[PDB]
């Protein structure tokens with residue numbers, strides 16, 4: 001058998017549960033003794049789980065870093081022990097050289113770029129300003145930093161679009177509502193809302209409704225991930241644009257775990273594809289989704 005030690009961020013978003021399910025299911029399917037762990041959103045619990053895998057003498061450890069910083073010591077402790085590290089979706093802020101074999105994930109900057117370009121293409125003939133409200137991700141995580149940056153690059157070529165308000169909602173529906181209701185009270189006029197993970201955008205669409213305002217027409221929503229519940233919102237008309245982030249890493253993580261453990265060469269970075277849908281596109285996209293996605297993943301590209 002091959003032993004894989006995986007430590008997860010938590011289970012905040014629908015994307016996370018899909019990512020977890022895809023990792024656990026793909027291990028069975030490929031035949032890998034998975035020693036999965038859940039930090040529940042706190043780095044110290046992710047560290048501990050990574051530290052326990054070293055003491056359990058696992059063959060290859062792999063994790064999804066809750067926040068970019070703080071890993072230096074632990075990532076060097078795995079290199080001392082000789083167990084290789086394969087990273088998933090979120091990146092790290094590390095100094096030391098060759099502290100991880102590869103990193104499977106997505107291009108969060110273009111995901112944000114894609115959204116911001118959408119806002120802009122739609123508000124081209126805007127006779128007056130357009131008020132964008134940003135529901136930021138967990139403070140410190142790679143997707144939250146990179147999406148914010150990309151979304152700005154999208155807006156930048158049009159001064160009529162300005163981020164009137166921006167605040168963290170921790171990638172949850174709770175936070176997504178809590179922060180959106182605050183923007184509904186504080187900011188007087190909102191033309192569109194950018195949710196860094198449809199989950200916050202869903203909590204936000206409850207706040208749009210709860211304040212007697214129509215989602216998808218009064219205030220337009222535009223988000224990332226393309227989860228079931230999100231895609232359904234768009235299919236109905238409560239959302240306007242979702243940019244797909246692929247959660248089904250499992251199959252490739254297992255392939256790369258076999259390659260790494262054996263010692264076969266692996267590319268330095270693998271980026272999963274992305275697409276985006278309008279209401280009508282999402283309507284036709286909703287049917288055999290788990291197959292369509294698992295097929296999309298197979299079309300990944302390498303950064304050797």
Ligand SMILES: OC[C@@H]1O[C@@H](O)[C@H](O)[C@H]1O
Pocket residue numbers: 012013014015016089090143171196197198199224225245
């Ligand atoms: O790391 C990827 C992000 O993590 C999840 O919490 C978000 O939904 C997803 O976009």
Ligand SMILES: [Zn+2]
Pocket residue numbers: 021024025
């Ligand atoms: Zn299952």
Ligand SMILES: [Zn+2]
Pocket residue numbers: 072073076095096
């Ligand atoms: Zn160091």
Ligand SMILES: [Zn+2]
Pocket residue numbers: 228229
């Ligand atoms: Zn579902």
Ligand SMILES: [Zn+2]
Pocket residue numbers: 244275292293296
């Ligand atoms: Zn797809």
Ligand SMILES: [Zn+2]
Pocket residue numbers: 270300302
């Ligand atoms: Zn490949």
Ligand SMILES: [Zn+2]
Pocket residue numbers: 267302304
């Ligand atoms: Zn290649």
Ligand SMILES: [Zn+2]
Pocket residue numbers: 271301302303
């Ligand atoms: Zn590329």
